[PDB]
Structure 1
Amino acid sequence: AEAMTLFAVACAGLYPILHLGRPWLFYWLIPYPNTHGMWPQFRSALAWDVFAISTYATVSLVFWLVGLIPDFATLRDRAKNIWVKRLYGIAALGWRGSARHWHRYEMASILLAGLSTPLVV
């Protein structure tokens, strides 16, 4: 399901650029230091929309990767081949599934879910 969210957000993230008519200027909706001194309005809903999709995509990606870390460890433990290893190994960050690590993992996952619920809403 979360994989479907990341892919659906990736597909939905093209229409705000494609429908623009001047697509290459999409970064003008982002508060960036410019030679002009112009800001986004922030009173329109498209400025909220830019901040919302960016936060939604980044938080869903880091939450998905946090959930994938133990599975990365189980894959690099069963990868058999040496070069299939070291690929999931750096993805698992050398998980070494142990106590004093599962505690912080469960609490961070609880906080992440409690934060992502009002995010998607």
Structure 2
Amino acid sequence: AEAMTLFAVACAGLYPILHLGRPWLFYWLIPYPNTHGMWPQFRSALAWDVFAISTYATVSLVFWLVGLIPDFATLRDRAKNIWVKRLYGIAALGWRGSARHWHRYEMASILLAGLSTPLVV
């Protein structure tokens, strides 16, 4: 389900740029240092859309990767090929699942889940 969320957000993120009429000027909505001194309005709802979709995509990706880190550790152990290993292993970041790693992991997952529920609404 979370993979579906990431891929659906990836699909839906194209439309704000595609429908834009001048699609290569999408960066204007984002605050960015420019010689003009111009700013986004921040009172329209498309400026809010830029912050909501971008925050939603990044938070979903980090939460999904944090969940995958223990799974990557099982895959690297069962990979059975030296090159297949070290690809899951770098993603695993030497997980070495242990107490004092699980305790922080469980608390972080609860906090990320708590932050995500207001975010998606």
The TM-score bracket by the shorter chain reads: over 0.9
Identity %: 100
User: SS at 1:106's partner residue?
Assistant: helix
Q: Give distance in 1, aligned partners of 2:15 and 2:63.
A: 24
User: SS at 2:75's partner residue?
Assistant: helix
Deviation at 1:110, TM superposition (A): 0.1
Q: Give distance in 1, aligned partners of 2:71 and 2:108.
A: 17
Calculate the TM-score normalised by the size of structure 1: 1.00
Q: Give distance in 1, aligned partners of 2:117 and 2:100.
A: 27
Deviation at 1:30, TM superposition (A): 0.2
Q: Give distance in 2, aligned partners of 1:47 and 1:80.
A: 49
Structure 2: give runs of 5+ residues left out of the alignment.
Answer: none
Aligned to 2:81: 81
Deviation at 1:19, TM superposition (A): 0.2
Runs of 4 or more, structure 1, over 6 Å off, are none
Aligned length: 121
Structure 1: give runs of 5+ residues left out of the alignment.
Answer: none
User: SS at 2:81's partner residue?
Assistant: coil
Deviation at 1:80, TM superposition (A): 0.5
**RMSD (Å) for aligned C-alpha atoms:** 0.3
Deviation at 1:56, TM superposition (A): 0.1
Q: Give distance in 2, aligned partners of 1:77 and 1:41.
A: 52
Q: Give distance in 1, aligned partners of 2:5 and 2:22.
A: 28
Render the CA deviation track for 1:32-71: whole Å, top value 9, x for unaligned. 0001000000000000000000000000000000000000
Q: Give distance in 2, aligned partners of 1:109 and 1:47.
A: 29
Aligned to 1:72: 72
Deviation at 1:116, TM superposition (A): 0.2
Deviation at 1:98, TM superposition (A): 0.2
Deviation at 1:11, TM superposition (A): 0.1
